[model samples]
Target: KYFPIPVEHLEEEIRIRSADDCKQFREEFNSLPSGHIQGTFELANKEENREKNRYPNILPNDHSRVILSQLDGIPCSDYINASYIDGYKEKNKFIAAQGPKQETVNDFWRMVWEQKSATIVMLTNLKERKEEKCHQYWPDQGCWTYGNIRVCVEDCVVLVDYTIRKFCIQPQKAPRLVSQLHFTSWPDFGVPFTPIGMLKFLKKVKTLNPVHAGPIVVHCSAGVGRTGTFIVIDAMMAMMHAEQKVDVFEFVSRIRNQRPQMVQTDMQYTFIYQALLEYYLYG
Candidate 1:
């Protein structure tokens, strides 16, 4: 059927169509403390010299946080609410980050410039419900300088549910082109109305950058719930295509191990199941 092996044949506990089945799966999910949860808290506790994070509750796990080695030709605090998350069949393929606040905006561009990241996937709007979610990290239509980096918006294309933005980032040394895919319809701490739109957007991202390309930076307000969901869906679908089988529980567990509270709610977890099922049947 699928790569000579179906998912259920490998993991007998993978079914989640029924209410009872989803209930059991939810219990299993809640039972374990995803790896490095405590370590994230410990690193986040030291707010003394760290840059002001937008959300106190959302912090990057120290083990995977991106550290800025140099800022303006001097060593600086590398702490940003950003984590380098592994993608399926690739290591450090994605970076999950909190939307930059007013203060950390420069740090965000520094990361894009230093990491040589090729794409930025912004999942939250600049403001949601009159509350600031993410800073306008890139320029509207022209060039803007952030510390050592100067960013210019080369092109902007608006889609139904998202926008495709092309940016040129220039540091003192060199410059790079980065594509930002902004999905505007995703609600905070919630799922989209249909996975169809989200899946199309994900496909667009993959089409923009191959696996060999630099990591794609993904972020929502907190960089946990929605960020995690997008990463899991893309990675799991990649696995399904390559291996013809996927263990939803194992997939989520492994991601949570690296980035704590990924797939934050049982509803999000269930949404994963629903989306995958649709893909399996019709993708």
Candidate 2:
């Protein structure tokens, strides 16, 4: 015989046996304000925001403009063409002769000279991991200057910074690139108003552009993930300024088109959207 009603499936419901008990539970559940409920650890693309909220000025410093690019693989030959490189060969004593290798250096100089690119910085907060994965290579010995381009790593997240001659090539504008992942705080590393810190970081990036020209290179471990998320948020703010409402998916898709691995996960996509919501609110 089949029973019409199943009682065991109905789990036990918690009840407040006394007024004090009820009060305690309410305080615990609602302790986290609604504003704090949406973030990387919370809801996805949560647009629930407050109006006329005060926020710190996170505007970038004067000099450069930041744009996003999407490239595939660890060695992004298409987007980042280093002059004198031949099929990723680990050769000692790389001499820059006029060719693809030279062209790469020349292009970077162009970005600096004509494009006014002051700095090509990478942000990696991997610490020891950075040493293991990236430091020993690339900018450590892969950077140089040509006719117009200046290609080099700003900070050594892992190994030695060998791209540029330590005492040579005095740059007009000296800029610093930091890894965003280095910030280790819950919800964020700063105080309650953490977005301000992020804005200041971007401002620092802006200030790093060539005093006189070029695009500033910004990247993380994957060049997407946290990297893409940050760029998309900035782009959204710009578009919104023009009174244009941008679709988040479209923005992410564009990054992916340029950089195939941008926003590699649904969870990451959600977190980015949540951050955007908070950004708009604080703006």
Candidate 3:
């Protein structure tokens, strides 16, 4: 859906002259207070919902937390560790979710079925070296049911930088196709050597996503660091495509307005600019 941009617009709007300004980005990030956000992380602090979280301190605020409003029968309190993130053009276009834990996997699938999400973008692995972050939420061979939704994984395509897993889902409503585009090589300590893999992965995501699909469910281990970065890159790119302009800082801040600790490091925040530069300049 993207078109060409005038050179002047890029120069005027972005104001990013060179890609070698990583330190500059960091200096800018340091001056701002991002994670010191306020709001009733109200539902997050509740005693009953504590087990649903993977980490004690990292929790979704009540304002933006995705609620599993109704199951099959009655509605008590169903919570998934996910925030509804808005894309450039559409409202609730992206869902930023934490990687499902063993206990929370059921709630994960239920959100998928109930929300009618078609694309799931996973930016982390089950175990990055020795540190185990997220639980395996999908079946490798046949099919598995999480809560009321049945997931049948028929295809697993592994590529250089990412893997795609195709699953057929039945949610008691009707069967729908869902795919997980899992990025494999994002580093644990530092950033990616280059942004080509991520740019190409973004491309793959765009084409694979259905036009009628509700939202692109994106996640990492905590659903904040890698998750937030990916969401911003995709969103800022969309902003560029649709309006021929982008505001990475404004967009990132807007996202953190919904969820806390998003784009956790200045390094990660800087990576966003790198991707945006690569997309507009080289792509």
User: Which of the numbered candidates is closest to the native, going by highest TM-score?
Assistant: 3
lDDT digits (tens) for residues 158-251 of candidate 3: 9989999999999646689999999999987877988899999999999999999978999998899999888899888888777766777777
List where candidate 2 sits over 4 angstroms from the true fold: 1-116, 126-131, 136-196, 207-212
Query: Which residue segments of model 3 deviate by more than 4 Å?
Result: 1-21, 70-76
Give one digit per residue, the lDDT tens place, for model 2 in 1-283: 1111112221111123113544532443233122122212111111221110111111111111121132245232222311111111121111111111222333333323333333433434334333421222223444554432344544533222112212123233553332212222213121223345554454554444444333334444434444555565556555544543435555544333333334434444444434444445565
Residues 141-181, candidate 1: write the lDDT tens digits: 78988877889999999988999999888874656779999
Q: Count steric clashes of candidate 2.
A: 27
Worst 10 residues of 3 by lDDT: 1-10
Model 2: ten consecutive residues of lowest lDDT? 91-100
- Model 2, residue 54: what's the lDDT? 13
User: Which model, 2 or 3, shows the larger TM-score?
Assistant: 3
lDDT of each: 0.77, 0.33, 0.82
lDDT of 2: 0.33
When summed lDDT is taken over every stretch of 10 residues in candidate 1, the lowest stretch is: 1-10
